[PDB]
Design an enzyme around this catalytic site. Sequence first.
Site, PDB file in Angstrom:
ATOM      1  N   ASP A  22       0.871  -1.161   0.000  1.00 51.55           N
ATOM      2  CA  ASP A  22       0.000   0.000   0.000  1.00 51.55           C
ATOM      3  C   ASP A  22       0.913   1.216   0.000  1.00 51.55           C
ATOM      4  OD1 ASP A  22      -1.777   2.107   0.462  1.00 51.55           O
ATOM      5  OD2 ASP A  22      -3.039   0.926   1.812  1.00 51.55           O
ATOM      6  N   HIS A 137      -5.939  11.825  14.652  1.00 47.04           N
ATOM      7  CA  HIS A 137      -7.045  11.515  13.742  1.00 47.04           C
ATOM      8  C   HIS A 137      -8.065  10.528  14.300  1.00 47.04           C
ATOM      9  CE1 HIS A 137      -5.066  13.783  10.723  1.00 47.04           C
ATOM     10  NE2 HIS A 137      -4.101  12.906  10.512  1.00 47.04           N
ATOM     11  N   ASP A 174       1.250  19.398  13.769  1.00 51.05           N
ATOM     12  CA  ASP A 174       1.298  18.403  12.711  1.00 51.05           C
ATOM     13  C   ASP A 174       0.768  19.073  11.452  1.00 51.05           C
ATOM     14  OD1 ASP A 174       1.382  15.069  12.474  1.00 51.05           O
ATOM     15  OD2 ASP A 174      -0.046  15.971  11.081  1.00 51.05           O
ATOM     16  N   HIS A 176      -1.250  17.756   9.268  1.00 52.38           N
ATOM     17  CA  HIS A 176      -2.614  17.298   9.025  1.00 52.38           C
ATOM     18  C   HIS A 176      -3.545  17.835  10.097  1.00 52.38           C
ATOM     19  CE1 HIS A 176      -0.107  14.250   6.929  1.00 52.38           C
ATOM     20  NE2 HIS A 176      -1.088  14.277   6.044  1.00 52.38           N
ATOM     21  N   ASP A 267       5.722  16.343  10.349  1.00 47.43           N
ATOM     22  CA  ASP A 267       5.498  16.365   8.916  1.00 47.43           C
ATOM     23  C   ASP A 267       5.205  17.770   8.403  1.00 47.43           C
ATOM     24  OD1 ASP A 267       2.953  16.567  10.111  1.00 47.43           O
ATOM     25  OD2 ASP A 267       2.299  14.630   9.329  1.00 47.43           O
TER      26      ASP A 267
HETATM   27  C1  LIG Z   1      -1.799  11.251   0.663  1.00 49.51           C
HETATM   28  N1  LIG Z   1      -3.037  11.897   1.306  1.00 49.51           N
HETATM   29  C2  LIG Z   1      -2.664  12.391   2.578  1.00 49.51           C
HETATM   30  C3  LIG Z   1      -2.367  11.237   3.544  1.00 49.51           C
HETATM   31  C4  LIG Z   1      -3.001   9.927   3.230  1.00 49.51           C
HETATM   32  C5  LIG Z   1      -3.953   9.782   2.263  1.00 49.51           C
HETATM   33  C6  LIG Z   1      -4.368   8.409   2.185  1.00 49.51           C
HETATM   34  C7  LIG Z   1      -5.283   7.684   1.405  1.00 49.51           C
HETATM   35  C8  LIG Z   1      -5.439   6.326   1.598  1.00 49.51           C
HETATM   36  C9  LIG Z   1      -4.678   5.657   2.575  1.00 49.51           C
HETATM   37  C10 LIG Z   1      -3.751   6.338   3.346  1.00 49.51           C
HETATM   38  C11 LIG Z   1      -3.591   7.729   3.175  1.00 49.51           C
HETATM   39  N2  LIG Z   1      -2.746   8.689   3.822  1.00 49.51           N
HETATM   40  C12 LIG Z   1      -1.773   8.393   4.884  1.00 49.51           C
HETATM   41  C13 LIG Z   1      -1.418   9.368   6.025  1.00 49.51           C
HETATM   42  C14 LIG Z   1      -0.178   9.995   6.110  1.00 49.51           C
HETATM   43  C15 LIG Z   1       0.148  10.831   7.180  1.00 49.51           C
HETATM   44  C16 LIG Z   1      -0.744  11.072   8.225  1.00 49.51           C
HETATM   45  C17 LIG Z   1      -0.402  12.007   9.374  1.00 49.51           C
HETATM   46  O1  LIG Z   1       0.731  12.352   9.630  1.00 49.51           O
HETATM   47  N3  LIG Z   1      -1.510  12.563  10.178  1.00 49.51           N
HETATM   48  O2  LIG Z   1      -1.104  13.421  11.200  1.00 49.51           O
HETATM   49  C18 LIG Z   1      -1.972  10.441   8.133  1.00 49.51           C
HETATM   50  C19 LIG Z   1      -2.299   9.616   7.072  1.00 49.51           C
HETATM   51  C20 LIG Z   1      -4.333  10.952   1.465  1.00 49.51           C
HETATM   52  K   LIG Z   2      -2.362  20.145  12.789  1.00 45.06           K
HETATM   53 ZN   LIG Z   3       0.378  14.375  10.038  1.00 43.86          ZN
END
Ligand SMILES: CN1CCc2c(c3ccccc3n2Cc2ccc(C(=O)NO)cc2)C1
Ligand SMILES: [K+]
Ligand SMILES: [Zn+2]
Length: 634
Positions: A22, A137, A174, A176, A267
Amino acid sequence: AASGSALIFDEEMSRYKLLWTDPECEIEVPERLTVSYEALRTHGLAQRCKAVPVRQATEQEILLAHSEEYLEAVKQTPGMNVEELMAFSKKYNAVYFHQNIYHCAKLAAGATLQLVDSVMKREVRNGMALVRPPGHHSQRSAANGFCVFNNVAFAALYAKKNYNLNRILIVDWDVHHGQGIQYCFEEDPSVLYFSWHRYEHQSFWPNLPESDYSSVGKGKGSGFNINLPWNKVGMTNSDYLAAFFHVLLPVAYEFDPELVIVSAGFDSAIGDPEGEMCALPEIFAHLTHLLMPLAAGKMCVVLEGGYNLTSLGQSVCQTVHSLLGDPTPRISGLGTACDSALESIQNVRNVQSSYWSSFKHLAQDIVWPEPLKRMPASVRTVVVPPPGVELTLPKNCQHSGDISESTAKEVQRIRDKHFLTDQNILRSLGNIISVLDRMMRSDEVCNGCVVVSDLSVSVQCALQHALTEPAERVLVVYVGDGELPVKTNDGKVFLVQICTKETEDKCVNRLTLCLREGESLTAGFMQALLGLILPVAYEFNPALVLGIVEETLMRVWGHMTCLIQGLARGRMLTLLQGYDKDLLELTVSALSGASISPLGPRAPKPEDVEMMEKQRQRLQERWGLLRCTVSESW
Ligand SMILES: CN1CCc2c(c3ccccc3n2Cc2ccc(C(=O)NO)cc2)C1
Ligand SMILES: [K+]
Ligand SMILES: [Zn+2]
Ligand SMILES: [K+]
């Protein structure tokens, strides 16, 4: 009063990983934890921290934030094979499961709870938990975005329940949006959540309309949720600091939290493949330092994301460096936030102006230079009280009235050139020179405080001797109403002056703050400090800070002294005119890195906010870090 920094980590949390292909999830790796701890060890930081063991979060503790149904479902994952683990993962978005991840999630959450207990029991001042999986999250009944349980939301609910806290600040830096934290506290005015995040007009994951600046909270929680969307990638140190000076810090200091919890995802650092931002690891030294005067320094830093193993280790060390009190790195090249960031900042400030009046406006292959070394001074603070005054100093302070012969020759040199004979003044001038020489010409001393009798002679020799150290730029911060022998006509000096008589300001290398009398004076000063003084000081980037107080407020001097040590690697020399036992001890305490007593609660006078905004209009074209709106194109 507590001391030390906790560091909470266990190799067990590196013992789960992605078990199928993945490309999206494959960035969340065990090595994130191992690289961060090893970077802390390499730099001697882990060794200076109190190691506190991780523990499992109990079932009861997990149920503070999550439902019985969701916990029961996760509790079955250790019995699952790979086929069953993949099918269980696909019930959720952007998260993968592993035989060991339920165990590690209880460790990540328990580690956080251990950090909360260590800080709230005053066993340490502050600390950091390096944990996997991340938390911000996850939601009441869902895993999401690599998160299983909401570590930081746990921490705030647990601190509320077990310490009866009324005000908790959560800072989520962060890259996100931590929607799980937002949802948890959206109706709760006791927890203030701030998040900046890559958004790109909702096109960036998690693609939620409620990650926008218009989500301010709900019901009694309105105003206690603050979203700052980044609608372009490439945000820089200046954007991040503009966010802090013009959104987060004004609200945080008025809120006056009793505990601060950081959802610390790195990040948001340069090189990260998720964030694609441009801020340097050194910025996290200042994000940490700017929050440390809150809650008497009670700060719980909890690792969220960060996926570039190199910017990860460096940003973790810069944070721990600041938690330990090491001098902050100088940040060069600061200026205006970019237009997209200014738009985001202006938009959040406007929608929040109904809740934080301070925001009211009146109608109309990646590479970066390696971070330099950060080293605490041999002795942090030198103090020179009046002759024959012995005081009890903190253990990292020291007297120093011992003028050397080299110094004594220089004092006579200066005396015969520019001035007369008062052997007391002449001794203080020897102290100024000796302290300055130890501050600049060595890593032996960080900063100092000298009590002084004749201001004009003392300022001149301090400033002039500082320039030839050499100090290419000197920030001068003066509380008084006089006029000093300080020239601001060559760009080598910026003069901040807080006085009582309104005096018109001409050129743009001077900021004069004339604040009205009354109980309103404290809040006005803090608003000036965060909204005007610090943006300019940070852009100016001085090599020395020179503080000056005339014998003729000052409930804020400890806060200014602490925050201003973000400049010049903490090299600040303060001259106090006349002996005042308490102001001298307050100054020494803040210079030496001790915790700052909170300010508590009265909003500023409209005349004061008008004066300060008049100063922003006058100065922001020269000093772009002052801007909190998009500039009008001609
Ligand atoms: C690339 N896009 C942003 C991130 C993501 C997406 C996504 C889609 C499907 C599976 C995992 C995924 N991810 C993985 C992902 C990567 C980083 C983080 C994170 O750091 N949250 O604080 C959380 C999730 C969409
Ligand atoms: K944040
Ligand atoms: Zn993040
Ligand atoms: K809230």
